[PDB]
Design a protein around this ligand. Structure first.
Ligand code: UFV
Ligand code: ZN
Length: 197
């Protein structure tokens, strides 16, 4: 009915990381630690770091799924709006209905859940690159938060789950997302609203 959003590092110490992109008017993606909220432009690269304390088993995967943040909307499937699901901006792999895409990974798989009808995109863990300390996945959000007939100004969360080869839970993290024209301005505004309040 409703996916859990409880943060869970699990045995491998799984958690997300975000770049420090700032809040200039020109910024296309920016993360607010105080709000735990990502602000991004439509269909632009959102780099999300995946951190672990130890390497999970071969066959481990990382899934992304959106849900509505407000409880009274949480049972509604988050999907692209009636305009964007029809605008033929297919990358050849993502179904046109899916809000969240993975960029530049030919091993990405897109799931329409047969029971819940929710959408998700999942990628397989690969051996850690030599010299690096984390891995980065690049997501795209394919509707504005404001899209009528879709998210319709309702806030969403992205839930990132670390899964074993059967789909069982190994780890979980999450963040709010606003897809908007001016992420820098909106992050500054919402952080100011938080400070005042
Ligand atoms: N090496 C690696 C580690 C992780 C983890 F989520 F475990 F951090 C996710 C991915 Br995708 C890769 N490729
Ligand atoms: Zn839309």
């Amino acid at each position: 009915s409703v996916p859990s959003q409880k943060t869970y590092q699990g045995s491998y110490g799984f958690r997300l990381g975000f770049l420090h992109s700032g809040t200039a008017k020109s910024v296309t993606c920016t993360y607010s630690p105080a709000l735990n909220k990502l602000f991004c432009q439509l269909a632009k690269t959102c780099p999300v770091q995946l951190w672990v304390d130890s390497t999970p088993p071969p066959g481990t995967r990382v899934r992304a799924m959106a849900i509505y943040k407000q409880s009274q909307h949480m049972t509604e499937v988050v999907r692209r709006c009636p305009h964007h699901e029809r605008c033929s901006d297919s990358d050849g792999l993502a179904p046109p209905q899916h809000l969240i895409r993975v960029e530049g990974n030919l091993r990405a798989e897109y799931l329409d859940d047969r029971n819940t009808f929710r959408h998700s995109v999942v990628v397989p863990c690969e051996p850690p690159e030599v010299g690096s300390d984390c891995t980065t996945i690049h997501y795209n959000y394919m509707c504005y938060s404001s899209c009528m007939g879709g998210m319709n100004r309702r806030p969403i969360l992205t839930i990132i789950t670390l899964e074993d080869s059967s789909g069982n839970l190994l780890g979980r993290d999450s963040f709010e997302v606003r897809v908007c024209a001016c992420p820098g301005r909106d992050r500054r505004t919402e952080e100011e609203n938080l400070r005042k309040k």
